[PDB]
Amino acid sequence: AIGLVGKKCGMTRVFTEAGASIPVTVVEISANRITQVKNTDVDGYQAIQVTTGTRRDSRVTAAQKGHFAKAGVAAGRGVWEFRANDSDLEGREIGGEILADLFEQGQMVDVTGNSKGKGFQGGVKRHNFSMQDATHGNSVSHRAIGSTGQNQSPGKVFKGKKMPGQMGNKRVTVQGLEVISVDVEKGLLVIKGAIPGATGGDVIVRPSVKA
Amino acid sequence: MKTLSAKPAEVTHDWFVVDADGKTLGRLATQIASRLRGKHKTNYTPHVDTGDFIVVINAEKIAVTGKKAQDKKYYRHSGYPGGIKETNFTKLIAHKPEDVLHKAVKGMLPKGPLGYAMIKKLKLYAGTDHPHEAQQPKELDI
Amino acid sequence: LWIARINAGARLNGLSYSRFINGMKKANITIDRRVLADIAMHDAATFGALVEKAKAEL
Amino acid sequence: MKVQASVKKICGSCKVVRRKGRVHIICTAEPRHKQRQG
Amino acid sequence: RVAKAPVTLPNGVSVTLNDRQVEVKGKNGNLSLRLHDLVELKQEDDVVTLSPTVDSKEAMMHTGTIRALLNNYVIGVTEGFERRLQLIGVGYRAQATGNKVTLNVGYSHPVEYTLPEGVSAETPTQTEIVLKSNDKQQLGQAAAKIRGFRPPEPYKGKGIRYSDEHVIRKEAKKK
RNA sequence: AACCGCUGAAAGCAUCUAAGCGGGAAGCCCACCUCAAGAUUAGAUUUCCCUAAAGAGCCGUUGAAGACUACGACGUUGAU
RNA sequence: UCGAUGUCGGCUCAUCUCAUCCUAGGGCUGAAGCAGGUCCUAAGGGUAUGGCUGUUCGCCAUUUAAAGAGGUACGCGAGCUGGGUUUAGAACGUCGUGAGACAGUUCGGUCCCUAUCUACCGUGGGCGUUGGAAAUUUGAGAGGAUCUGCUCCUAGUACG
RNA sequence: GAAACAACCCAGACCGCCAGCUAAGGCCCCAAAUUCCUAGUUAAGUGGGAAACGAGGUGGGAAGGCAUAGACAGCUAGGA
């Protein structure tokens, strides 16, 4: 149930010999150093804590510097934790190594990332609200919300009403994506799909939960 | 001569254990509610908490009579339209055993800042053990 | 307030308030509930002796 | 079955049985005689 | 009437009551039933006479079922029970291999059924299942569960049916 | 749930039910995704620091982050 | 309620009920199969586009698994519209001597408000969380989502 | 007092009291006062909405018909 953290490198295509174009995305997979192994006895639950990337020393706090030093690993750009089980905590020891070898070609994986942020967005784009008449006497409410409720009964707006607000820039998971190719010497992970976020953003890849 | 209050600095709360194994839910909740309010004390004043700390063990073993285990319904509204939920006494006792007795007692107390303070002294646990041996609570069959 | 204080005091040693007031009435004891609640809350020995006089009367 | 406010035995091979506080009619002779009060 | 009738114990069988838990032992096996808390069980010379605690309609109604269930255990351990199933159909056939019986009635897949622990099935021919068990309850459920895969049809009689079960027959294409 | 049971008495029979044992729906509770300890019951683990420390902020260069914020990166030991 | 609670319809955006339209599970059937008919359970989702008319509706065309019945100030004009109704102009028919009138018709005819509180959608600041700090997190709970066609095969088999 | 409730029930406020008795209504907790006593009924949370009509729920009361010249039910045989 454990995965790895990567960085979105952009999209491309993979051509099959039969003459099909596969829309793929490239995920750079640096070393995932294991910074802590949490178990049911010390933490109440089993998980693996990993780090990847690098940070300069001036940008690493003393508390983090000691957290990494106990593991014996270099400070990464972030710290991510994967919920595991007894079978997953087999060869995973403190300061260990997690490469792209975790995945094999043809395996369905779950990729999570932060979506591109659109900022404040109206109901038309945020919630697929129908636009109102561009002509036919329509006043200054072309992309307006329309009605937001009923009359005196209930005399309020219900909670969860679809309205303008912040769009994107949220955690989003795409399921059922195939691993097109794995290359570990160069830290490659080619995956079929779209992978929420922009180029350069951190993405987490885990084995698919649907199965 | 005047009728004096309890002077919170001068009041002390005593610790007791109630083993809620097989006792009727409401017949016990009234007893706990009175003790949390401090109605058994001669210096009881309704604006000072003169109650006691009650530790309840075996909160999952509390009993209801009749057909109430399958028919007592616990509704709650989440705050969203159509957000009304329901659960049974037996389904709630199997998911949150302390919540059955905590909920009976809460409705039997005053509903206000002092009421919130005196339910904070009800330390109820599902099982035969409680983490309050430091307070040395005395056994109380109530 | 007095009745609740008296009820707690009587129940500490013996009977309830409803049986306490009946006992005081049968013993021709005129002590008001104001004074009784002050005895209960401030001198438990006297209230213990006072309950006994009501308890022997019923 | 027929689920109605009046359930009564029809032919003579019908039984009045109550299960779960509810009155049924069961017939070993005619399956369309099956009734339930409700 | 049922409750007052004593249960006669044959030579092989023996009944022991240990903490409100009747244990019936004999030649076929060991059966046990929970004695209701409103019924007392007393023993005499090779007979079991069980009576209610208090003389009430509810206690006389629960001692009638303990008498009946225990009498089934006595006979069910003395010589056991046996239920017969019949398959009617052009291709309806069943085969019993151990505790698992497979039957091919009309589906796009043979259905596999595993017998409850305590019931055994043997099929002499391919369209007739014979079930044997100690307790009548587990035998009856095993037969009801096999028969529920394809209950008998009212137009041709096809489907698993009990032996000596009256199957209602309806006429197709009437006017 | 409706519905169908097994064994079974009240009620010598019968009976899904009274004791006991089953099957059974896109419905309920989980399971999936997102948020979530202001869950004031404010939880847990790993480190770091305490004669202004550990850090955080201001400021600056800024960003597929963004109304302002917040969030992310960097500030010469540097590709912001 | 007349020191003012804006009328019908449309648009936009909904929320709930179940007396269920589809899908799901069943009993009976004058249930062979395929299709149905009734009644029980079931509200999780889903539940068209047009021509006509101001229309809601209704008729019709073509679909669809289905084109549900309702409540919500006959939901929703400080969200939009303004076709009808219902001002002032004008005309026809009709009534009136007439000024005029018509749940008769016809052509035409100003829709204001920068949001304080509640509510809701987002996004912050403060303080608290038994010294402080950097991170990682458990999950009491909350929300989202929940639809369905067709083809092949079983098998032209069961049934007829 | 009737949850809240001009018109219902109890009762007619001169003022003050940290005195007592009661009315209607009440006495497990919110919330003052009985987890009071005696004999029963209900198993429906009826109590704490709703009828014709239906049912083998359960308790009680006046009578009856049949019965060890074997009554009711079951099973066997006949039912011409």
PDB file of C-alpha atoms in Angstrom, chain B:
ATOM      1  CA  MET B   1     -28.757  34.750  59.655  1.00  0.00           C
ATOM      2  CA  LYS B   2     -28.430  34.324  55.894  1.00  0.00           C
ATOM      3  CA  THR B   3     -28.451  31.425  53.453  1.00  0.00           C
ATOM      4  CA  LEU B   4     -24.900  31.105  52.144  1.00  0.00           C
ATOM      5  CA  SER B   5     -23.513  29.715  48.901  1.00  0.00           C
ATOM      6  CA  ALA B   6     -20.813  27.072  48.474  1.00  0.00           C
ATOM      7  CA  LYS B   7     -17.842  29.326  47.591  1.00  0.00           C
ATOM      8  CA  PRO B   8     -16.192  27.329  44.734  1.00  0.00           C
ATOM      9  CA  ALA B   9     -12.713  27.646  46.252  1.00  0.00           C
ATOM     10  CA  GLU B  10     -14.028  25.827  49.338  1.00  0.00           C
ATOM     11  CA  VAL B  11     -15.739  22.939  47.496  1.00  0.00           C
ATOM     12  CA  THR B  12     -14.049  19.616  46.765  1.00  0.00           C
ATOM     13  CA  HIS B  13     -15.198  16.990  44.270  1.00  0.00           C
ATOM     14  CA  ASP B  14     -14.955  13.329  45.268  1.00  0.00           C
ATOM     15  CA  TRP B  15     -14.161  10.438  42.934  1.00  0.00           C
ATOM     16  CA  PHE B  16     -16.392   7.381  42.576  1.00  0.00           C
ATOM     17  CA  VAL B  17     -16.650   4.349  40.293  1.00  0.00           C
ATOM     18  CA  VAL B  18     -19.978   3.061  38.982  1.00  0.00           C
ATOM     19  CA  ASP B  19     -20.019  -0.365  37.319  1.00  0.00           C
ATOM     20  CA  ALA B  20     -22.751  -0.026  34.687  1.00  0.00           C
ATOM     21  CA  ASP B  21     -23.019  -3.774  34.022  1.00  0.00           C
ATOM     22  CA  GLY B  22     -26.621  -4.808  33.424  1.00  0.00           C
ATOM     23  CA  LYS B  23     -28.159  -1.685  34.952  1.00  0.00           C
ATOM     24  CA  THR B  24     -31.016   0.112  33.232  1.00  0.00           C
ATOM     25  CA  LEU B  25     -29.845   3.035  31.115  1.00  0.00           C
ATOM     26  CA  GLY B  26     -32.190   5.714  32.436  1.00  0.00           C
ATOM     27  CA  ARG B  27     -32.438   4.364  35.975  1.00  0.00           C
ATOM     28  CA  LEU B  28     -28.666   4.818  36.269  1.00  0.00           C
ATOM     29  CA  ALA B  29     -28.415   8.077  34.314  1.00  0.00           C
ATOM     30  CA  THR B  30     -30.653   9.893  36.804  1.00  0.00           C
ATOM     31  CA  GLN B  31     -28.411   8.751  39.660  1.00  0.00           C
ATOM     32  CA  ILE B  32     -25.264   9.962  37.886  1.00  0.00           C
ATOM     33  CA  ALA B  33     -26.875  13.257  36.876  1.00  0.00           C
ATOM     34  CA  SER B  34     -27.789  14.071  40.480  1.00  0.00           C
ATOM     35  CA  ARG B  35     -24.262  13.292  41.694  1.00  0.00           C
ATOM     36  CA  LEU B  36     -22.673  15.418  38.965  1.00  0.00           C
ATOM     37  CA  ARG B  37     -24.907  18.296  40.062  1.00  0.00           C
ATOM     38  CA  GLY B  38     -24.104  17.754  43.743  1.00  0.00           C
ATOM     39  CA  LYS B  39     -27.714  17.400  44.892  1.00  0.00           C
ATOM     40  CA  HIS B  40     -26.716  14.953  47.646  1.00  0.00           C
ATOM     41  CA  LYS B  41     -24.643  17.603  49.448  1.00  0.00           C
ATOM     42  CA  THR B  42     -26.105  19.895  52.097  1.00  0.00           C
ATOM     43  CA  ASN B  43     -24.166  22.859  50.678  1.00  0.00           C
ATOM     44  CA  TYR B  44     -25.775  22.463  47.253  1.00  0.00           C
ATOM     45  CA  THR B  45     -26.300  25.788  45.510  1.00  0.00           C
ATOM     46  CA  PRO B  46     -27.628  25.733  41.925  1.00  0.00           C
ATOM     47  CA  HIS B  47     -24.971  28.212  40.704  1.00  0.00           C
ATOM     48  CA  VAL B  48     -21.902  26.361  42.039  1.00  0.00           C
ATOM     49  CA  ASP B  49     -20.752  22.924  40.902  1.00  0.00           C
ATOM     50  CA  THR B  50     -20.714  20.938  44.151  1.00  0.00           C
ATOM     51  CA  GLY B  51     -20.821  17.587  42.362  1.00  0.00           C
ATOM     52  CA  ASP B  52     -18.496  14.612  42.217  1.00  0.00           C
ATOM     53  CA  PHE B  53     -16.338  12.957  39.591  1.00  0.00           C
ATOM     54  CA  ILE B  54     -18.043   9.754  38.465  1.00  0.00           C
ATOM     55  CA  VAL B  55     -16.056   7.066  36.661  1.00  0.00           C
ATOM     56  CA  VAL B  56     -18.316   4.608  34.835  1.00  0.00           C
ATOM     57  CA  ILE B  57     -16.928   1.261  33.702  1.00  0.00           C
ATOM     58  CA  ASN B  58     -18.616  -1.365  31.528  1.00  0.00           C
ATOM     59  CA  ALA B  59     -20.485   1.398  29.703  1.00  0.00           C
ATOM     60  CA  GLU B  60     -21.148  -1.045  26.848  1.00  0.00           C
ATOM     61  CA  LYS B  61     -22.844  -3.488  29.251  1.00  0.00           C
ATOM     62  CA  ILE B  62     -25.599  -1.042  30.193  1.00  0.00           C
ATOM     63  CA  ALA B  63     -29.056  -2.417  29.470  1.00  0.00           C
ATOM     64  CA  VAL B  64     -32.417  -1.237  28.161  1.00  0.00           C
ATOM     65  CA  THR B  65     -35.726  -2.981  28.774  1.00  0.00           C
ATOM     66  CA  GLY B  66     -38.521  -4.014  26.425  1.00  0.00           C
ATOM     67  CA  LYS B  67     -37.642  -3.898  22.732  1.00  0.00           C
ATOM     68  CA  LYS B  68     -35.577  -0.719  23.055  1.00  0.00           C
ATOM     69  CA  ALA B  69     -32.201  -2.152  22.018  1.00  0.00           C
ATOM     70  CA  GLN B  70     -33.482  -2.526  18.446  1.00  0.00           C
ATOM     71  CA  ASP B  71     -35.939   0.384  18.534  1.00  0.00           C
ATOM     72  CA  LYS B  72     -34.391   3.293  20.447  1.00  0.00           C
ATOM     73  CA  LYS B  73     -33.370   5.685  17.669  1.00  0.00           C
ATOM     74  CA  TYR B  74     -30.607   8.294  17.905  1.00  0.00           C
ATOM     75  CA  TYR B  75     -31.148  11.006  15.305  1.00  0.00           C
ATOM     76  CA  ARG B  76     -28.742  13.796  14.453  1.00  0.00           C
ATOM     77  CA  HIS B  77     -28.700  16.496  11.781  1.00  0.00           C
ATOM     78  CA  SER B  78     -25.395  17.314  10.117  1.00  0.00           C
ATOM     79  CA  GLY B  79     -26.362  20.855   9.080  1.00  0.00           C
ATOM     80  CA  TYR B  80     -26.763  20.109   5.340  1.00  0.00           C
ATOM     81  CA  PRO B  81     -30.074  19.790   3.457  1.00  0.00           C
ATOM     82  CA  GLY B  82     -31.481  16.315   3.887  1.00  0.00           C
ATOM     83  CA  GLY B  83     -28.691  15.675   6.379  1.00  0.00           C
ATOM     84  CA  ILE B  84     -30.708  13.695   8.920  1.00  0.00           C
ATOM     85  CA  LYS B  85     -29.083  10.521  10.260  1.00  0.00           C
ATOM     86  CA  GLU B  86     -30.245   7.760  12.584  1.00  0.00           C
ATOM     87  CA  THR B  87     -28.718   4.862  14.496  1.00  0.00           C
ATOM     88  CA  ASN B  88     -29.896   2.227  16.965  1.00  0.00           C
ATOM     89  CA  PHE B  89     -29.048   1.749  20.609  1.00  0.00           C
ATOM     90  CA  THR B  90     -27.420  -1.572  19.733  1.00  0.00           C
ATOM     91  CA  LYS B  91     -25.663  -0.188  16.657  1.00  0.00           C
ATOM     92  CA  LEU B  92     -24.426   2.801  18.658  1.00  0.00           C
ATOM     93  CA  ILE B  93     -23.321   0.637  21.589  1.00  0.00           C
ATOM     94  CA  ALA B  94     -21.337  -1.463  19.089  1.00  0.00           C
ATOM     95  CA  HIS B  95     -19.725   1.635  17.537  1.00  0.00           C
ATOM     96  CA  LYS B  96     -19.413   4.150  20.399  1.00  0.00           C
ATOM     97  CA  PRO B  97     -20.348   2.458  23.682  1.00  0.00           C
ATOM     98  CA  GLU B  98     -19.717   5.483  25.906  1.00  0.00           C
ATOM     99  CA  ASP B  99     -21.955   7.671  23.747  1.00  0.00           C
ATOM    100  CA  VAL B 100     -25.139   5.882  24.870  1.00  0.00           C
ATOM    101  CA  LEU B 101     -24.674   6.680  28.557  1.00  0.00           C
ATOM    102  CA  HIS B 102     -23.026  10.040  27.894  1.00  0.00           C
ATOM    103  CA  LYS B 103     -26.098  11.073  25.912  1.00  0.00           C
ATOM    104  CA  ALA B 104     -28.655  10.026  28.530  1.00  0.00           C
ATOM    105  CA  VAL B 105     -26.807  11.938  31.254  1.00  0.00           C
ATOM    106  CA  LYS B 106     -26.286  15.029  29.095  1.00  0.00           C
ATOM    107  CA  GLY B 107     -30.029  15.465  28.588  1.00  0.00           C
ATOM    108  CA  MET B 108     -30.635  15.091  32.333  1.00  0.00           C
ATOM    109  CA  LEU B 109     -28.400  18.057  33.262  1.00  0.00           C
ATOM    110  CA  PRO B 110     -28.952  21.812  33.015  1.00  0.00           C
ATOM    111  CA  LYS B 111     -28.205  23.193  29.545  1.00  0.00           C
ATOM    112  CA  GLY B 112     -25.726  25.996  30.098  1.00  0.00           C
ATOM    113  CA  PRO B 113     -22.170  26.891  31.099  1.00  0.00           C
ATOM    114  CA  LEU B 114     -22.510  25.204  34.496  1.00  0.00           C
ATOM    115  CA  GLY B 115     -24.155  22.207  32.844  1.00  0.00           C
ATOM    116  CA  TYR B 116     -21.235  21.874  30.441  1.00  0.00           C
ATOM    117  CA  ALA B 117     -18.849  22.036  33.395  1.00  0.00           C
ATOM    118  CA  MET B 118     -20.490  19.275  35.424  1.00  0.00           C
ATOM    119  CA  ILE B 119     -20.676  16.796  32.538  1.00  0.00           C
ATOM    120  CA  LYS B 120     -16.914  17.254  32.149  1.00  0.00           C
ATOM    121  CA  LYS B 121     -16.639  15.315  35.428  1.00  0.00           C
ATOM    122  CA  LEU B 122     -18.326  12.196  34.002  1.00  0.00           C
ATOM    123  CA  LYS B 123     -15.440   9.939  32.960  1.00  0.00           C
ATOM    124  CA  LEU B 124     -17.143   6.915  31.421  1.00  0.00           C
ATOM    125  CA  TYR B 125     -15.333   3.992  29.811  1.00  0.00           C
ATOM    126  CA  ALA B 126     -16.297   0.872  27.877  1.00  0.00           C
ATOM    127  CA  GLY B 127     -14.633  -2.072  29.580  1.00  0.00           C
ATOM    128  CA  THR B 128     -13.664  -3.053  33.121  1.00  0.00           C
ATOM    129  CA  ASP B 129     -10.692  -0.689  33.513  1.00  0.00           C
ATOM    130  CA  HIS B 130     -10.306   3.063  33.882  1.00  0.00           C
ATOM    131  CA  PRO B 131      -7.173   5.255  33.850  1.00  0.00           C
ATOM    132  CA  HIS B 132      -7.945   7.032  37.121  1.00  0.00           C
ATOM    133  CA  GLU B 133      -6.357   4.909  39.855  1.00  0.00           C
ATOM    134  CA  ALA B 134      -4.324   7.981  40.830  1.00  0.00           C
ATOM    135  CA  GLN B 135      -7.535   9.659  42.014  1.00  0.00           C
ATOM    136  CA  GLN B 136      -8.442   6.564  44.103  1.00  0.00           C
ATOM    137  CA  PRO B 137     -12.187   6.584  43.313  1.00  0.00           C
ATOM    138  CA  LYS B 138     -14.368   4.710  45.794  1.00  0.00           C
ATOM    139  CA  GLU B 139     -16.836   2.079  44.617  1.00  0.00           C
ATOM    140  CA  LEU B 140     -20.411   3.377  44.490  1.00  0.00           C
ATOM    141  CA  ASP B 141     -23.421   1.194  43.674  1.00  0.00           C
ATOM    142  CA  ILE B 142     -25.835   3.765  42.289  1.00  0.00           C
TER     143      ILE B 142
END
